[PDB]
Design a protein around this ligand. Structure first.
Ligand SMILES: CCN1C[C@H](C)n2c(c(O)c3c(=O)n(Cc4ccc(F)c(Cl)c4)nc(C(=O)NC)c32)C1=O
Ligand SMILES: CCN1C[C@H](C)n2c(c(O)c3c(=O)n(Cc4ccc(F)c(Cl)c4)nc(C(=O)NC)c32)C1=O
Ligand SMILES: [Mg+2]
Ligand SMILES: [Mg+2]
Ligand SMILES: [Mg+2]
Ligand SMILES: [Mg+2]
Ligand SMILES: [Zn+2]
Ligand SMILES: [Zn+2]
Lengths: 213, 269, 210, 210, 269, 214, 210, 212
DNA sequence: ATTGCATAAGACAACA
DNA sequence: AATGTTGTCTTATGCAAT
DNA sequence: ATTGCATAAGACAACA
DNA sequence: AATGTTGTCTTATGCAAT
């Protein structure tokens, strides 16, 4: 995850004036991000992945087309600043843009679904655009698509729920710090610690405790 | 001789040390003659029950608004923090309109998911008819604090102060003393987002994000000693979470979870 | 919306119900202010059916000050006139169906009938209801229409019918004259002694007296 | 002996009054904390009569939680047991005549009989009540015992429908009879059972009562 | 690898802990990269030099007015304290006019003697021409604090709060909830005067009056360790007076008397 | 010894209308004069006077005066008993209960006029300057010298000295023995500086290592 | 006054001490009170020129000189002296209030010093030929560098003539554009960056910049 | 040796400049630390002319705690000592022409001669000047001497009249560079200024180190 | 050793 | 111009008794 | 032991 | 209706080295 991303700028008439729609999609998780744009600009170019980075993280590479605002020096300098590897492609190639096909299809489907669901047919109210975008974002990212046994979130974050503190070594009476223990609570000068085998919780002074490995 | 002591306190209201030194009287009689006067002891017990918190991620959320002069002409910002994980979501608007909260929460949902409850102050548009109706449509709780103390939302308020500090740091490190161009607004906001959520703060060894997506909750806490309201420490409960500030404890039989200040709890044995 | 309080002005009328047959007659007493109701049961129109009605009505919801009625013959009967003389409450006549005397009792009859039909279809009786189920059905309709608020209002129709502490204010003083009602974990609600009103204040903002 | 709160504890019994023939089989039901007395007349002991009085008693007092009753072939019958289950109300049946729970209901029955008597012979119906007068006389006696008086209480029953601690005085003793309503960090707010007076006492001057 | 750390701080302004954890770096480089940013530390040094005091009795005095509702129609009171011995004198007047200020001092003078300096806030009548010329006629100094902080005269203000507390205790301990009859004003003031001056306050073993008339002053202090402003503790001075709040220390050769925060001094050897 | 007997009377002062009645309280062991003034000769005014005189000087042991209406009246009597001061009366003008009162009266009557001519007031000083005049007269009579000795009444009254040493305390030595002959100087936190009463040698010592002497 | 070396006021006076050369030549600076006096026993163009320049020599180059319409002050020699000096010359009566009166008062104080010094040495009205310059110069020293009046800085210090910090204000903000002049032990005088006005402030209400 | 202090020690001597004729004589006084010079250019040499020069000198510049002059009959007169007693200033005498405190006076006299000559040749008078422009030449020379800097020296004689310790700071490079004197020092950091650029910066208290 | 105590150390508030 | 103060309260601690 | 360090513990602020 | 919070900073402590 957070390895390769794609992107494209797609039209849609119902969100006039800011009818320019930006897309960016991951590969390993197929997570989506969308931003409105009044007009496609190399600066609006900046504005998108900055938002995309915050919600997902910093990827390792990005692949796109040869767009006008995709190729100016501003974007190159900014991606260099963040240390992310650009890789342009053909405006429509499949060996490059490959997940964005399913992306665009699902995004337009969901946008149409919601736009007609909330009693609109040709123009979303200007105050109600971001609402629909956020709803589509949440629906397509937190819910499985088609056969998917997991939503994009589950693949992207591995959202398990651990219940044990980190492995920690405790100063034993011989002076050494035996590993295999996990802290439970960091109180005042005292931290309750358990043994991974006996499952006994013991209060030990904060001076005799240090993490494992 | 405490008859003259009683007369002296009644006609003079003298402190216990001077009473002891002025009538050849000791510790005890000085005390139980000084506490007899009701006027000598009025205030010195003001209770302090200080405990808002949620337990697991997407359970309790907080929200306020911010006036940011650099963000002109879109100064108003709505900030949302997940109490369990301390993750932050913000959005930029121009009016305090209910529609802005409509949008701000919607984006917050898209990034973090669906919480259960949202605590907030009784803002002019928080309790509006449309806002409440739409919130019910989404199906999540809403609980306003006491009407007037912007202190029950202390988490979102402190997050507000921190976000203002961070955004001003970025802005005036970018060479913008008074205000930010309309172009750079979103870049500053998103950079602040990535800085805050994806990097751990202070000294905790846990990033707020992987705190949120990988929460750790104890199924059975350790035994502790508890300053039960009666005034003295009691033995036989378990602490669920013990934050730097404040803690939550659980009974061994009734299995009640309550939020108490950390001073009320100390470790068992 | 008259500003007068409860127990002041009443309104009485009977009604017909083939469901409740053979005991097919019913009467309800309603207040102009509280809109609270008392329901009796009978099968024939009599001066004592209202007497059964009034006794049930006066006991549940207190004594009335004035009652506005119609020109029914049994309402001026000797028995009920002696009853009212023993009561001490005046009796007034009028025209049967004006907007000043018969203000809400007819609509109350209609609403009670609608409730009885909807509950009869809820528990499974369409045409008529046996005399065994009448008591509990009437009780359920009464509880739904009285214990629960109907429509919109700041208080329910049944609602229509502390140690001393010092709290702070925005000025920063410690005014006296309040009593805590509920003692929350970090909050409290206090009732003033003179203005007898409840306000919620955080625990860290109040201290007692004496 | 005084209860803890209204609409949480109930109790009932069976009474027969020969003057109410042939529907002489009453069904008494009274609360403990709120001490609200209600009855419903019928002409035999049966599951039908028990569930009719109970369902009527549900809405005239409040939705029940757990009612304590006596042994018999009516409450323990299958229909009334499933009625208890369906209405979500428990059963705490005991000895038919147990002193711990039925002395109050027996006293209430004696009071009801005495009131029916006194009011009936005040009206002029001495021995037995006719059909058209039974409901009115029952309502009359109930009215006599709704909102005038109970007989001894300064706080009437339907008007209502802290752990003990020892405190300290200057005398030298630790006196009991105080329940803390409100607790403070440097005091306590206790109230006596008898004087029902709230006084701020320092935390030093209190200790648990047993 | 500190190059990426420098970039990360410059474009992102990260705390040293997260920078150390996120680029496999340690204590030092994390520090001297986080202090390079001028924006990462702006306020956190606010100097606090807090030391008004006199040395011997009748050397330095303070004064303020008080609005006491219980003293109507003569609510205004003039309070004077001798900083050396903490004696108090209060006089009652109807107006804050200079003539009242004239009256208050000489009454205090007749009780405590003649001081040399009287610090006061720049009241509308303290700096009045008549007050100044009359004071010069008496012939003792007059120094005003900074124009606006009623905090440099902290001693007279604290004694003001104490006196108001005592007079309230006396008034409502005698059966006057809201105000005082004209027949009771003078004896209430006299009793309040007698209580504070002629009796101990708190834990000090020396009465204010017998402090004033029978003061003790050290002619040569004991060696101490002194936080000279040089950063650390310098050795070689002697403390003259060390109050619970704050102290004064003397040079061994320059013979300078200086009022210094008590945290800046600790015992020698 | 100081503060054993007091004396009191009134004095009518026409130069001081309308508050023309003046009370004078005089110590006997130190001749310290305390005065306060009231328009009408009632009770409440004159116990106000006595309260002020007590506040400025302290609590005496006995007060001698005339047999005036208020001086032995009840209010005054139980007020004085609650204060716990021994009242004394006598012939209204006797040379024993009023031995020094008249001397103080003539001294004050000279001083008030002297000052009135000093600021050029002849018939009656305005109500504004009355209190200032009284305070100035009190300062002149008390702190200065009108006798021919080397001790002002204040010097007689309060025993005004300038001490140099704190109270003596018995320090504990490291072997565990308490040891007197030491007097504390500075009560610094944790460490208190105590000086050897003989060698004038100071030393820093922990707090609990020292206890008060006698 | 605003700044030194701006306005100079020269007038002549007579003191009978140094007769027969009893005439004097004195210049007064309005904004600094600095004074130069050169003995000149004959009011002439040479005498006024010699003292005028000696006044510049003692203090420094001015921008203007204010005098009266004396024929020895607007003569061609004096006009050319001022022209080659590049300063301004303004006439007068003299005797105005705001200007041309401080010169007279300064003359009064200068002679005050000469009389007190002469009577200290032992001369009443006539002084030896080896004493006039001595007395006048001693008076210059006494008046100039010894503070006269109720100021903190001597008149010569009243002649010709920090790091940036952020201060709190009543609002609680922390504004920039400030510099510290004097650093007290618990206090500080701060000057604005632009207005360049100095006010004092508690040391606890300032924090530095950058 | 100039770290004594301004308005402390003054040096006086007579030099005979060839342009002041017929009022040739001239008394000169200088200050070691403040580098401030004041003269009167009398027409006679004597104790009366000496103290008339001296007493105007002290009015112009300040109050010295000591005034030093070469020994001779021109300064040891009893009237001069009565003047000193009237001003209460200690006096000492030295060799008439030693290097203890008179080389500076000699160089100051030569500087006065050169400045006077160049000013005179600028005005138009080569050899002699009328008795009316002597004072203006003196005033212009004094303004050049006092207000304006002499030579490469930055500190004008004014700056050394009525006016932090040097410290070294911590640089990122590894240089404890000098040229820094703290002005206002706080407990978190200081406010230093350079000696040549004279720019004020705030540097952490761990970033500083005193000088010598 | 445990509990209790006597003291010491430290914290809080409010003065127009 | 020329600066916090301290009584009151609370908690912690060591000794002395038990 | 002395110095320095690595750590921990405690304190302040401000957000309509 | 439904309650302070915590990052940043300063001070103190102990161990490890010298
Ligand atoms: C010019 C006439 N004048 C006053 C101005 C109006 N003032 C006067 C006062 O007496 C006070 C005063 O007592 N305090 C109380 C206070 C606040 C904080 C402290 F730290 C302390 Cl030792 C005292 N405040 C002010 C004030 O205004 N603003 C804080 C005040 C006064 O006499
Ligand atoms: C009615 C709509 N409304 C607000 C009232 C006006 N308000 C609102 C706010 O957001 C704040 C706010 O943030 N703070 C800052 C603050 C002050 C002290 C604290 F302890 C914390 Cl934790 C926060 N104060 C106020 C205020 O009421 N009086 C200072 C406040 C708001 O949204
Ligand atoms: Mg808010
Ligand atoms: Mg807020
Ligand atoms: Mg003031
Ligand atoms: Mg004040
Ligand atoms: Zn008291
Ligand atoms: Zn930074």
């Amino acid at each position: 995850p957070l390895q390769i991303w794609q992107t494209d700028f797609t039209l849609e008439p119902r969100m006039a004036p800011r009818s320019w729609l930006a897309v960016t999609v991951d590969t390993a998780s197929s997570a989506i991000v969308v931003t409105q744009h009044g007009r496609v600009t190399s600066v609006a170019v900046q504005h998108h992945w900055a938002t995309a980075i915050a919600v997902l993280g910093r990827p390792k590479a990005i692949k796109t087309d040869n767009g006008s605002c995709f190729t100016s020096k501003s974007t190159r300098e900014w991606l260099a600043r963040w240390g992310i590897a650009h890789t342009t492609g053909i405006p429509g190639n499949s060996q490059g843009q490959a997940m964005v096909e399913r992306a665009n299809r699902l995004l337009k489907d969901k946008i149409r679904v919601l736009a007609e669901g909330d009693g609109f047919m040709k123009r979303i109210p200007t105050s109600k655009q971001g609402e629909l975008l956020a709803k589509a974002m949440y629906a397509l990212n937190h819910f499985e698509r088609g056969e998917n046994t997991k939503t994009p979130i589950q693949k992207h974050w591995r959202p398990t729920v651990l219940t044990e503190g980190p492995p920690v070594k405790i100063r034993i009476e011989t002076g050494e710090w035996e590993k295999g223990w996990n802290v439970l609570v960091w109180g005042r000068g005292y931290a309750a610690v358990k043994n991974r085998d006996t499952d006994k919780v013991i209060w030990v002074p904060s001076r005799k405790v240090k993490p494992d490995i | 001789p405490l008859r003259e002591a009683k007369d002296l306190h009644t006609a003079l209201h003298i402190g216990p040390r001077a009473l002891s030194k002025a009538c050849n009287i000791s510790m005890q009689q000085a005390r139980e003659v000084v506490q007899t006067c009701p006027h000598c002891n009025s205030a010195p017990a003001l209770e302090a029950g200080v405990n808002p918190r949620g337990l697991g991620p997407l359970q309790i959320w907080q929200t306020d608004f911010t006036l940011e002069p650099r963000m002109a002409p879109r100064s108003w910002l709505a900030v949302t923090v997940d109490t369990a994980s301390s993750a932050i979501v913000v959005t930029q608007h121009g009016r305090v309109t209910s529609v802005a909260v409509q949008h701000h929460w919607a984006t917050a949902i898209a990034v973090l998911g669906r919480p259960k409850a949202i605590k907030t102050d009784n803002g002019s548009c928080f309790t509006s008819k449309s806002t409440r109706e739409w919130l019910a449509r989404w199906g999540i709780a809403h609980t306003t604090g006491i009407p007037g103390n912007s202190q029950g939302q202390a988490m979102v308020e402190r997050a507000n102060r921190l976000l203002k500090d961070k955004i001003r740091v970025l802005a005036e490190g970018d060479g913008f003393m008074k205000r930010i161009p309309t172009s750079k607004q979103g870049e500053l906001l998103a950079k602040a987002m990535y800085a805050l959520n994806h990097f751990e703060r202070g000294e905790n060894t846990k990033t707020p994000i992987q705190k949120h997506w990988r929460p750790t909750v104890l199924t059975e806490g350790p035994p502790v000693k508890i300053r039960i309201e009666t005034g003295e420490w009691e033995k036989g409960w378990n602490v669920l979470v013990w934050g730097r500030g404040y803690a939550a404890v659980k009974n061994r039989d009734t299995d009640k979870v309550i939020w108490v200040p950390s001073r009320k709890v100390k470790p068992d044995i």
